[PDB]
Scaffold this active site. Structure first.
Site, PDB file in Angstrom:
ATOM      1  N   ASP A 174       8.592  18.992  36.382  1.00 56.22           N
ATOM      2  CA  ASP A 174       8.117  18.886  35.024  1.00 56.22           C
ATOM      3  C   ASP A 174       7.451  20.182  34.704  1.00 56.22           C
ATOM      4  O   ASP A 174       8.058  20.991  33.936  1.00 56.22           O
ATOM      5  CB  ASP A 174       7.179  17.750  34.696  1.00 56.22           C
ATOM      6  CG  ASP A 174       7.037  17.591  33.167  1.00 56.22           C
ATOM      7  OD1 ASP A 174       7.403  18.531  32.382  1.00 56.22           O
ATOM      8  OD2 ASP A 174       6.585  16.513  32.776  1.00 56.22           O
TER       9      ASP A 174
ATOM     10  N   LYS B  49      14.187   8.080  32.272  1.00 57.26           N
ATOM     11  CA  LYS B  49      14.364   9.114  33.280  1.00 57.26           C
ATOM     12  C   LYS B  49      15.298   8.728  34.401  1.00 57.26           C
ATOM     13  O   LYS B  49      16.143   9.517  34.841  1.00 57.26           O
ATOM     14  CB  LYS B  49      13.051   9.557  33.871  1.00 57.26           C
ATOM     15  CG  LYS B  49      12.285  10.493  32.971  1.00 57.26           C
ATOM     16  CD  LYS B  49      10.865  10.554  33.486  1.00 57.26           C
ATOM     17  CE  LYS B  49      10.042  11.571  32.727  1.00 57.26           C
ATOM     18  NZ  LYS B  49       9.155  10.890  31.801  1.00 57.26           N
TER      19      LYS B  49
ATOM     20  N   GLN C  55       4.619   9.839  36.170  1.00 58.86           N
ATOM     21  CA  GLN C  55       4.500   9.486  34.756  1.00 58.86           C
ATOM     22  C   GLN C  55       3.000   9.365  34.374  1.00 58.86           C
ATOM     23  O   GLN C  55       2.257   8.709  35.079  1.00 58.86           O
ATOM     24  CB  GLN C  55       5.132   8.105  34.477  1.00 58.86           C
ATOM     25  CG  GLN C  55       5.145   7.712  32.998  1.00 58.86           C
ATOM     26  CD  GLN C  55       5.966   8.663  32.156  1.00 58.86           C
ATOM     27  OE1 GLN C  55       7.157   8.996  32.475  1.00 58.86           O
ATOM     28  NE2 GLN C  55       5.385   9.129  31.109  1.00 58.86           N
TER      29      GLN C  55
END
Length: 281
Positions: A121, A54, A98
């Site tokens: 997200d 990422k 995460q």
């Protein structure tokens, strides 16, 4: 497998190039560079890799990645505090945390604390990983352009659970010159078999394991299998029998598993959309 792997890598690279152009146009217009906070808690190997991918995607596009690597055992309280700080920081446009978090089975309260305007997200089908969400209707042709296989004049079959996800792919293949058939999950098994056996291009989007035995696949076919089925034992399979399919297909999508490059690239796109949305009021 003699079949080559048709994965997200090249469509991701293309999207990252396009996103870098956008960030440059923002900086040409006096706008800030977008900032992405990526939080990792602990040292799980897969997570560490995912987070590294990422941050590397972010740097490739020119998003400023702000790294928070926290020790395992960090509690919910300290994560909420961090989140509140990122929420308040105007250089931070997107926040990714995460998962999984060591010791925090339910991450809901943390995810919900992320300011919705920074929630970049935010799945029985791997649509995102292949650029095949209905909102990107050109996706199936882009994906096929990264094979060496012809499109125009070829037989395509789309096997779909909803008319709604299949329709934009069917359509783009029609316009690309394919002869197209749409089969639904309810299509009788013998009819289904017939249409799979005729297909040079096979797109399967049902989310049912075992729907299409691999030996049905036409020799030389491009197989795009986006089902993600979690079996009894933890394992992930597509809707198509991969080992048998991969001995016949010229190209095949990989077994689902992990977080591919296209998903990561779309997270960067969401970051830039969030930063763009913030320039209103």
């Amino acid at each position: 497998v003699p079949a080559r792997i048709l994965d997200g890598r090249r469509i991701a690279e293309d999207l990252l190039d396009e996103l870098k152009t956008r960030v440059d146009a923002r900086l040409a217009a006096g706008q800030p560079r977008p900032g992405l906070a990526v939080v990792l808690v602990g040292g799980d190997p897969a997570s560490t890799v995912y987070v590294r991918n990422k941050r590397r995607a972010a740097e490739k596009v020119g998003i400023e990645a702000f790294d928070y690597d926290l020790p395992a055992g960090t509690g919910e309280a300290e994560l909420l505090s961090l989140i509140d700080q990122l929420n308040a920081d105007p250089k931070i446009h997107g926040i990714l945390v995460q998962l999984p978090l060591p010791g925090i089975a339910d991450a809901s309260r943390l995810i919900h604390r992320i300011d919705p305007r920074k929630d970049v997200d935010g799945g029985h089908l791997a649509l995102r990983e292949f650029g095949l969400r209905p909102c990107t209707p050109r996706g199936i042709v882009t994906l096929l352009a990264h094979t060496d296989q012809p499109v125009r004049g070829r037989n395509a079959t789309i096997v779909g659970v909803s008319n709604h996800v299949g329709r934009p792919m069917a359509l783009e293949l029609l316009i690309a010159g394919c002869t197209v058939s749409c089969c639904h999950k309810f299509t009788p098994a013998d009819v289904l078999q017939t249409h799979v056996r005729d297909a040079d291009i096979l797109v399967v989007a049902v989310g049912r394991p075992g729907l299409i035995p691999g030996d049905w696949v036409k020799p030389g076919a491009v197989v795009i299998d986006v089902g993600i089925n979690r079996l009894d034992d933890g394992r992930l399979v597509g809707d198509v029998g991969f080992e048998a399919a991969a001995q016949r297909a010229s190209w095949i999508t990989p077994v689902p598993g992990g977080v591919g490059p296209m998903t990561v690239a779309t997270l960067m796109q969401n970051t830039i959309e969030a930063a763009d949305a913030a320039l209103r009021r």
